[PDB]
Design a protein around this ligand. Sequence first.
Ligand code: HEC
Ligand code: HEC
Ligand code: HEC
Ligand code: HEC
Ligand code: HEC
Ligand code: HEC
Ligand code: HEC
Ligand code: HEC
Ligand code: HEC
Length: 292
Amino acid sequence: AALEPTDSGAPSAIVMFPVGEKPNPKGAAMKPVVFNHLIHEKKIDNCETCHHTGDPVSCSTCHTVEGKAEGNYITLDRAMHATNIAKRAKGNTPVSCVSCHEQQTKERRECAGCHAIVTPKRDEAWCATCHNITPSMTPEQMQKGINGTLLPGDNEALAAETVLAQKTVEPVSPMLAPYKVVIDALADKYEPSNFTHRRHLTSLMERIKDDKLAQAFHNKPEILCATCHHRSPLSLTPPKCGSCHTKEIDKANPGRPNLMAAYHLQCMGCHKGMDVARPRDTDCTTCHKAAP
Ligand code: HEC
Ligand code: HEC
Ligand code: HEC
Ligand code: HEC
Ligand code: HEC
Ligand code: HEC
Ligand code: HEC
Ligand code: HEC
Ligand code: HEC
């Protein structure tokens, strides 16, 4: 009913609104964001990582929709989503919501294998992971949020209602995907690659099964399939790599590797990203035995 209190004295969960000084009477905006401060302060040790000026104050006090001098005119949009934040010579380097989450996927071995070969779509479901407010908020409450006159008890009630109705999407079972796949499209100098498809997916999922960040953004049941089966609709039976990646040079599609290179770059890309000890990329027979 009431969320767990924070040690910091920040609200446990917080509705964040599109704060600006230009009137916005029709509520032309994204859904507000309910930020779970409790979860974040328990995992991120230093308050100042986020509150980069040292002030434990709402970001929008300086970073408004239009920008303003207190935030060096860096807007709300930039503060919350920036991904190319320069390192600061002196003092703190700010983080945004998106940049820290990205750092998680690059710097953590259990994430960095898949995320070395994923190009995130960042579609509406990605936005909605944060832009996630309860349907109960009214347009009048939105206006007050924007204008800064929403009562703190109203903000917390909206935040708690939102948090308590949140549900994590369960990833499909690896049992609904092939056990092994005999990858023989190109077989010539080597035997087919007997790819341990289910072993792979099962191992990758086990290492992230309780991770709250992953759970939130991996938000379609078949989404982890797209790690490898990219650029096609989510499906239990996606098209073969070689439907899109030709065996030979395809000058009409210079961004697409040919099929051998497609396998190598994807399989080896993940192996390198999560520091897989065997097979090394220089080992030419562990993924496929030499042909007689
Ligand atoms: C969490 C990691 C976020 C993701 C993913 C996206 N947004 Fe976001 N956005 C976030 C916050 C914390 C805020 C501030 C609170 C608010 O709702 O204003 C924002 C703000 C915006 C804005 C500016 C305000 C507005 O005009 O409503 C825009 C235009 C915006 N966000 C757009 C947007 C889109 C289109 C996204 C998916 C491509 C998206 N955001 C993702 C946090 C997060
Ligand atoms: C990033 C992962 C954060 C960490 C770590 C901490 N805080 Fe935080 N805090 C963060 C956000 C995105 C927000 C919401 C701002 C909004 O627009 O509503 C907050 C909010 C607070 C507040 C409320 C401030 C206000 O509304 O004026 C306080 C008092 C606060 N945070 C304190 C605080 C402390 C002491 C922390 C370390 C123990 C801490 N925060 C960590 C993001 C993050
Ligand atoms: C005024 C007291 C601020 C508050 C509160 C927050 N930020 Fe801020 N931020 C402020 C300034 C003056 C600057 C420029 C600092 C510099 O060294 O240049 C910034 C910058 C950022 C950035 C970097 C943008 C970029 O480099 O393109 C981000 C991502 C950012 N701020 C985020 C941010 C968040 C998430 C805040 C609440 C947790 C927040 N800032 C508060 C001023 C102030
Ligand atoms: C690193 C300095 C972070 C910043 C800045 C923000 N987030 Fe984050 N987030 C971070 C971690 C390490 C985690 C997982 C915590 C755990 O217990 O494992 C998360 C998680 C989320 C989630 C999912 C859980 C939840 O709160 O519902 C979301 C939707 C999320 N983060 C949103 C979010 C927003 C809106 C932020 C900017 C206002 C933001 N995060 C900053 C690390 C960091
Ligand atoms: C392969 C089995 C994965 C593992 C292990 C992890 N992630 Fe993942 N992630 C994967 C896919 C296929 C996608 C979809 C990309 C898209 O947007 O279409 C994602 C998405 C995310 C996101 C959202 C995209 C982004 O902001 O970069 C986040 C924040 C995310 N994943 C986090 C995350 C973390 C923290 C992980 C380790 C605990 C992790 N993922 C593992 C595939 C896979
Ligand atoms: C990379 C780590 C993968 C993940 C995650 C998933 N699959 Fe996969 N799958 C992968 C490869 C390299 C291949 C070979 C494709 C080729 O054209 O050579 C496959 C194959 C399949 C197939 C076809 C099997 C066949 O007999 O031809 C299916 C039906 C399939 N994959 C389904 C699938 C699903 C549903 C996934 C998520 C649960 C999934 N795969 C993940 C690589 C990877
Ligand atoms: C068409 C529906 C595709 C299927 C099926 C697969 N891939 Fe793909 N891939 C496709 C495009 C359009 C592109 C080019 C993207 C660009 O930057 O222009 C790619 C690219 C790759 C790459 C290069 C790195 C990357 O951008 O991801 C690799 C390593 C790759 N594709 C491998 C690959 C494999 C092994 C597939 C079967 C599991 C596969 N692709 C399917 C389009 C399509
Ligand atoms: C991450 C998204 C991966 C992709 C893409 C591929 N592999 Fe992989 N592989 C991965 C890990 C993390 C490991 C270590 C074992 C574990 O799960 O902890 C492996 C290991 C292998 C091995 C060794 C033994 C085995 O488990 O089968 C082989 C021969 C192997 N991988 C082959 C392989 C091929 C042929 C791939 C593309 C079709 C491929 N891997 C992709 C992680 C990932
Ligand atoms: C797994 C991580 C691999 C490693 C390491 C290497 N190769 Fe590979 N290669 C892999 C796959 C999944 C495939 C497709 C197999 C098929 O028959 O469709 C391939 C394919 C080739 C091919 C073309 C097929 C053939 O001639 O049999 C060649 C010539 C090839 N690979 C060469 C090669 C060499 C020399 C490697 C060590 C540097 C090497 N591969 C590593 C997966 C993997």
